[PDB]
Design a protein around this ligand. Structure first.
Ligand SMILES: *[C@@H]1O[C@H](CO)[C@@H](O[C@@H]2O[C@H](CO)[C@@H](O[C@@H]3O[C@H](CO)[C@@H](O)[C@H](O)[C@@H]3O)[C@H](O)[C@H]2NC(C)=O)[C@H](O)[C@H]1NC(C)=O
Ligand SMILES: *[C@@H]1O[C@H](CO)[C@@H](O[C@@H]2O[C@H](CO)[C@@H](O[C@@H]3O[C@H](CO)[C@@H](O)[C@H](O)[C@@H]3O)[C@H](O)[C@H]2NC(C)=O)[C@H](O)[C@H]1NC(C)=O
Lengths: 49, 49, 52, 262, 52
């Protein structure tokens, strides 16, 4: 689940597959700018720490 | 911890662009209409809207 | 292992040797922009921008 | 050997505020700040790469920076990075700068322009280091244990790291149009400027030398320098020139390594 | 506190500090430190540079 332990889970440290769920979302850019705004729930590993 | 990768935006001067899906973890893509971007020396994409 | 159009040359010995960048900068860069997914990218990049 | 920093250039990006509360396109825009070193060392990332002069030679005193599709260099001194207090600069190569900063709620990097004017960028960053162990001390003692910890080294060997690089977009400009009398002229200098005009079937295509219109006014023709020939960076503040993208790869310096802390 | 100081004719600093408790708070419902590159526009007031 987003924001808590194991938001992104990798079957092995060398495994290619990845499952990520952090509620990434995009928002409309402001007029007269080029920035690609977005919003995202912070890392679950840091808050678990 | 995760790392959000945000590639540079693609602004189509005088046209419309179509979003394409990909097999990436937690992928998000959208197209915004009516932008009039600006750069340091002048505002490219001559088409007004 | 790298490819250019229909060349399929070893990445260690590119056909532009030597001074690939000095002779044709843009051609060298567009060459490197098709090998990003090839495992032998870096050794090509080593040769591409190296000459005395 | 390889001098990979020959196909790369400094660029101009949009900084939130330039040390005064106002926003303008600075040459020293700050990208992501990485702080995964236990002892508390930061890897700040510029836009204007440092350590290599305008002529693509390694110099300990000259650092490149972009200025209106024109590269200049400034003395490596006066590179000041700061937080609530005043930081210490350890490493210096490419876009990346290493610092050990006092705790604070922001950091700024700045350097003197060609004409000795400060060019600064300020980013909001909550920095608060905690040393490894069970005591929250401040500076190392002259008698104590040794505890393993990680840090960023000064080596620039093979690192297994990536930066996406791509060709710069069609930079627009308007100082190159000069209306003399019922006609305009386009400046040159190596910039194969692209044009598009509305007057009488107009003119589509790119020139390489001077040109005259003889027909219409300024507000129909345009300047779009293409340049190419150099990889810039894959930054969200500068657009792409093509949908399927091109992408490159460059290795960042300063890997992460084990040491022991007292 | 705050102090204001400027050099004399003989390059001697002349200073004066007054006790003053400064603690600004930005307008709105977040105590942010510096302005972002994406947000709302909230009215405020400030001192202008004009001397009319
Ligand atoms: C140079 O600038 C002009 C604008 O002054 C560009 O002309 C614009 O071209 C686009 C597509 O090429 C037009 O978009 C679409 O055109 C169709 C035509 O029927 C229309 O039905 C659509 O609703 C849509 O508008 C655009 O209208 C047109 N603008 C004009 C004529 O004022 C031109 O493309 C530029 N040069 C290049 C090489 O792109
Ligand atoms: C600092 O030292 C630590 C340990 O002294 C280093 O961690 C070690 O990293 C190696 C990677 O080469 C790990 O080896 C791995 O073993 C697994 C099997 O368990 C294998 O699947 C991998 O392919 C790899 O061979 C090693 O296990 C790991 N040690 C521990 C205790 O986890 C670390 O890399 C050093 N450098 C730093 C932290 O920068």
């Amino acid at each position: 689940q987003p924001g808590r332990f194991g938001d992104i889970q990798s079957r092995t440290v060398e495994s290619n597959d990845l499952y990520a769920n952090t509620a990434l979302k995009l928002a409309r850019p402001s007029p007269g700018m080029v920035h690609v705004p977005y919003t995202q729930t912070p890392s679950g590993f840091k808050y678990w720490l | 911890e995760y790392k959000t990768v945000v590639p540079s935006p693609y602004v189509k001067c005088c046209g419309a662009s179509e979003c394409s899906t990909k097999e990436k973890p937690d992928y998000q893509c959208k197209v915004y209409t009516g932008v009039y971007p600006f750069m340091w020396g002048g505002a490219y994409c001559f088409c007004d809207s | 292992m790298c490819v250019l159009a229909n060349a399929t040359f070893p990445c260690f010995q590119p056909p532009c040797v030597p001074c690939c960048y000095e002779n044709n900068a843009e051609a060298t860069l567009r060459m490197l922009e098709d090998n990003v997914d090839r495992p032998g990218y870096y050794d090509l990049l080593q040769a591409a921008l190296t000459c005395r | 050997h390889f001098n990979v920093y020959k196909a790369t250039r400094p660029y101009i990006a949009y900084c939130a505020d330039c040390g005064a509360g106002h926003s303008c396109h600075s040459p020293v825009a700050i990208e992501a700040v990485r702080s995964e070193a236990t002892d508390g060392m930061l890897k700040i990332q510029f836009s204007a790469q440092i350590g290599i002069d305008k002529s693509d030679n390694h110099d300990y005193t000259k650092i490149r920076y972009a200025d209106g599709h024109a590269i200049e260099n400034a003395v490596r001194s006066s590179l000041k990075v700061a937080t609530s207090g005043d930081c210490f600069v350890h490493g210096t190569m490419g876009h990346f700068i290493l610092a050990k900063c006092p705790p604070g709620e922001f950091l700024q990097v700045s350097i003197q322009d060609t004409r000795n004017a400060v060019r600064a960028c300020r980013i909001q960053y909550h920095h608060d280091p905690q040393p490894v162990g069970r005591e929250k001390f401040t500076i190392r003692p002259h008698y104590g244990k040794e505890i393993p910890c990680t840090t960023y080294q000064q080596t620039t060997a093979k690192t297994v790291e990536e930066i996406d690089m791509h060709m710069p977009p069609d930079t627009p400009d308007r100082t190159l149009l000069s209306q003399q009398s019922g006609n305009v002229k386009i400046t040159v200098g190596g910039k194969k400027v692209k044009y598009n005009c509305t007057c009488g079937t107009g003119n589509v295509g790119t020139t390489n030398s001077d040109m005259t219109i003889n027909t219409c006014l300024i507000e129909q023709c345009h300047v779009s320098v293409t340049d190419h020939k150099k990889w810039q960076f894959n930054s969200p503040f500068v657009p792409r020139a093509d949908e399927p993208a091109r992408k490159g790869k460059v290795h960042i310096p300063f890997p992460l390594d084990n040491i022991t802390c007292r």
